Amino acid sequence: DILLTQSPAILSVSPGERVSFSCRASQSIGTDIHWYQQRTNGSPRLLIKYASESISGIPSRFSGSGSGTDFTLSINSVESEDIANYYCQQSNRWPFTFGSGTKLEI
Amino acid sequence: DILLTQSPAILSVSPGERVSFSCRASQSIGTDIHWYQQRTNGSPRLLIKYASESISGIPSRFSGSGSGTDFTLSINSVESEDIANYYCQQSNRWPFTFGSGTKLEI
Amino acid sequence: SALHWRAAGAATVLLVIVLLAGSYLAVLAERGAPGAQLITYPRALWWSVETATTVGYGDLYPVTLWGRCVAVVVMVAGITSFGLVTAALATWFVGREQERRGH
Amino acid sequence: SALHWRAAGAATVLLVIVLLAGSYLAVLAERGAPGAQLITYPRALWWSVETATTVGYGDLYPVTLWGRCVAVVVMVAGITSFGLVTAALATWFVGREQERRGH
Amino acid sequence: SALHWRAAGAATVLLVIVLLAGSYLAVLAERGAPGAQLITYPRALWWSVETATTVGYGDLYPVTLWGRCVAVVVMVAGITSFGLVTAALATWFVGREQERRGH
Amino acid sequence: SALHWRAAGAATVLLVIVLLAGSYLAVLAERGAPGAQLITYPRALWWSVETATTVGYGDLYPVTLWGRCVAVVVMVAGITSFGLVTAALATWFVGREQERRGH
Ligand SMILES: [Ba+2]
Numbered sequence: 001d002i003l004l005t006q007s008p009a010i011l012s013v014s015p016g017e018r019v020s021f022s023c024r025a026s027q028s029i030g031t032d033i034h035w036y037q038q039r040t041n042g043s044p045r046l047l048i049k050y051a052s053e054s055i056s057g058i059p060s061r062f063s064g065s066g067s068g069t070d071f072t073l074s075i076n077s078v079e080s081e082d083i084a085n086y087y088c089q090q091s092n093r094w095p096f097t098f099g100s101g102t103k104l105e106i
Numbered sequence: 107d108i109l110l111t112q113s114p115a116i117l118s119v120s121p122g123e124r125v126s127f128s129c130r131a132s133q134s135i136g137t138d139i140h141w142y143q144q145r146t147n148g149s150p151r152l153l154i155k156y157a158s159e160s161i162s163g164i165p166s167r168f169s170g171s172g173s174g175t176d177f178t179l180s181i182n183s184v185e186s187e188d189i190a191n192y193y194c195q196q197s198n199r200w201p202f203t204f205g206s207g208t209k210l211e212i
Numbered sequence: 213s214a215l216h217w218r219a220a221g222a223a224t225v226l227l228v229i230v231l232l233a234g235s236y237l238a239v240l241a242e243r244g245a246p247g248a249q250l251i252t253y254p255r256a257l258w259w260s261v262e263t264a265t266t267v268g269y270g271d272l273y274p275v276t277l278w279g280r281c282v283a284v285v286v287m288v289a290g291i292t293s294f295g296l297v298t299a300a301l302a303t304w305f306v307g308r309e310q311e312r313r314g315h
Numbered sequence: 316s317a318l319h320w321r322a323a324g325a326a327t328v329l330l331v332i333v334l335l336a337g338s339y340l341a342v343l344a345e346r347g348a349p350g351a352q353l354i355t356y357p358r359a360l361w362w363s364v365e366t367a368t369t370v371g372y373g374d375l376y377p378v379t380l381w382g383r384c385v386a387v388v389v390m391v392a393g394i395t396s397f398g399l400v401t402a403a404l405a406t407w408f409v410g411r412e413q414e415r416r417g418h
Numbered sequence: 419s420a421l422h423w424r425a426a427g428a429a430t431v432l433l434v435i436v437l438l439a440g441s442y443l444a445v446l447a448e449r450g451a452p453g454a455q456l457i458t459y460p461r462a463l464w465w466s467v468e469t470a471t472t473v474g475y476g477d478l479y480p481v482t483l484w485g486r487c488v489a490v491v492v493m494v495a496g497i498t499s500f501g502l503v504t505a506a507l508a509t510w511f512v513g514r515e516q517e518r519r520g521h
Numbered sequence: 522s523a524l525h526w527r528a529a530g531a532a533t534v535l536l537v538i539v540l541l542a543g544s545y546l547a548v549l550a551e552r553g554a555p556g557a558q559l560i561t562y563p564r565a566l567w568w569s570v571e572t573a574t575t576v577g578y579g580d581l582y583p584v585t586l587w588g589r590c591v592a593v594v595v596m597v598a599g600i601t602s603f604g605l606v607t608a609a610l611a612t613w614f615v616g617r618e619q620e621r622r623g624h
C-alpha cells in the first residue's frame with residue numbers, strides 16, 4: 001500500500017518567511033495528493049486538493065505543487081495562525097493513506 | 107516534476123581533448139532532452155535537440171547521445187570558444203525543466 | 213420513425229446509462245481491493261468511455277471480479293452500440309441507393 | 316430461423332468456446348516462459364475477453380509464440396463475431412425498412 | 419455521386435480536420451497539468467491517430483478534463499468514420515449483388 | 522465469384538502482405554532510434570498483428586516518424602479489411618434473407 005513520507009517532522013521558520021513541507025509517495029501517484037491542516041485540539045481542514053488546486057476559503061498564502069512521487073505544500077510569509085500540524089493524503093490507490101505529518105514552528 | 111541532475115558542476119580538460127557532459131533525469135524521458143550553451147554574458151544557444159539531433163550551424167564537433175534517464179553531450183577536441191556553461195532541458199513531461207548546468211574549463 | 217434510426221438512439225441513451233451505472237458500479241466493486249486505481253467517480257467515468265470505445269490506454273482498468281464483470285457489460289454495450297449505428301448507416305445508404313436506381 | 320440471426324448465435328456460442336479454450340491454451344503455452352504473467356486461469360479468461368473485444372489495457376498479454384498464436388485466434392474470433400452481429404443487425408434493419416416502404 | 423460514397427469522403431476529410439484540431443486542442447488542454455505528456459504537437463498528432471483508430475498503445479493519453487473531452491470527440495469521429503466506410507462498402511456490395519442476380 | 526466475397530479475399534491477402542511488409546519496414550525505421558523496442562522481426566510481426574486488430578497491449582509500439590507512418594498503414598489496412606468482411610457478411614445475409622422472403 002502507498003506509503004507517504006513527510007520529512008522533516010518539525011519545521012522552524014521566522015515570521016513572514018516562505019516555508020515548504022515535503023511529501024514523498026513510495027510510488028507514482030500523479031497529482032492525487034491532498035493537504036490538511038490541524039491545529040491543536042482541532043479537526044483536520046482541507047487546504048489543497050489534487051496537489052495544487054486551491055480550496056475556497058483558504059488564504060491565498062497557501063499553495064501546492066508536485067506530481068508523481070514528490071509533493072510540496074508551501075506557505076508565503078508564515079504567520080502565527082499557521083502554527084499547526086500538516087498532513088498529506090493520497091487517493092490514487094486503495095486504501096487511502098496519510099503521511100506522518102509535519103509540525104510548523106515559528 | 108522531472109529533475110535533471112548535471113554532475114559534475116565543473117569540468118576541466120586539456121585543449122583538443124574529448125569531453126562529455128552528463129545529464130540524468132529522475133525518470134525515463136525517452137530522448138526528450140535538449141542541450142544549450144551559454145557563454146559569459148550571453149544568451150542560451152541551442153546545441154543539440156532531442157538528445158542527438160545536430161542543429162544547423164553548430165560545429166560538427168558537438169554531438170549528443172542517450173535515452174531513458176541518462177544523457178551525454180560530447181565535444182570532440184575542445185577549444186577556447188567552447189569555454190562556457192552547458193544546460194540540459196526536458197520536454198517529456200509538463201512543466202519543462204532545466205539541469206543545474208556544467209561549466210567547461212580548459 | 214424508422215426502426216434502425218430508433219435502435220440507434222435507443223442504444224445511445226442506453227450506452228450513456230451503462231456508462232453512468234458503470235462508473236458507479238466500478239468504484240463500488242474496486243474499493244476494498246488493495247492496489248485498485250478505478251476508485252473515484254470522475255476518472256471511473258473516463259475509464260468507462262475508453263472501455264466502451266475499446267480505445268484502452270491502460271491508464272485504468274478493474275482488478276476485481278465484479279469490476280471486470282462491469283467492464284464486460286460496458287465493452288459489450290459500447291461495441292454493440294457503435295456497431296448498431298453502423299448497421300443503421302447502412303440501412304440508410306442502402307435505402308437511398310435504391311431510389312437513385314429504380315425502387 | 317433466419318440465417319443471419321443463426322450465424323450471430325453460432326458465433327456467440329463459438330466465441331464463448333474460443334474464450335474458454337483460449338484461457339486454457341494460453342496458460343499452457345505461457346507457463347514455462349520466464350516473466351510470463353498470463354499463467355493462472357481466472358485472469359487468463361479476463362485476458363481473453365479483453366482480447367476478443369480488442370479493448371486491450373495492457374495489464375496482460377502473451378509473451379510466447381503459441382500464446383500469441385492463441386491470441387490471434389481469440390482476436391479474430393472476437394472481431395469476426397462482433398462484426399457478424401453488426402451484419403446481422405443490418406440485414407434486420409434493411410429487411411424491416413423494406414416493409415415501411417413497399418416490399 | 420452516390421450519397422454513401424459521399425458521406426465516406428465527407429467523413430474522411432472531417433476525420434482529418436478533427437485529427438488536426440484534436441492535436442492542437444489536446445496540447446492546449448494538457449499543458450499546465452503536472453505530469454502531462456501529451457504536450458508537443460507532433461506526438462499529439464500521432465496520439466490522435468492511435469485514438470481515432472482505437473489502437474491505443476498507452477504511450478500517450480490525456481490527463482485533464484478538456485483533454486479527455488477532446489479525446490472523446492476524436493474516438494467518436496474515428497469510430498463513426500471507420501464505421502461509415504463499412505456501411506458504404508456494404509451499400510456497394512449490396513447494390514452490385516443485386517445486378518449479379520436480377521435487379 | 523461475387524465481388525464482395527472477392528474483395529474480402531483480396532483484403533485478406535493484402536492484409537497479410539501489409540503485415541509482412543509492415544514488420545520489415547518497422548524494424549528498418551526503428552533501428553537507429555535510442556530506446557526503440559520494435560527492432561527484431563518476429564516480435565515486429567506480432568506487433569503488426571496487434572496493430573491491425575487494434576488490440577494494442579502496449580508491449581510494443583513505434584517511436585520514430587516512419588515507424589508511426591508504417592503503423593498508420595497497418596491500422597488502416599487492418600480496420601479497412603476487418604470492416605470489409607463485415608460488409609461482405611452483410612451482403613450475404615441480405616441476399617439470403619431476400620429469398621426467405623420473396624425476391
Ligand atoms: Ba481497440
Ligand SMILES: [Ba+2]
Nearest residue numbers: 268371474577
Ligand atoms: Ba490498448
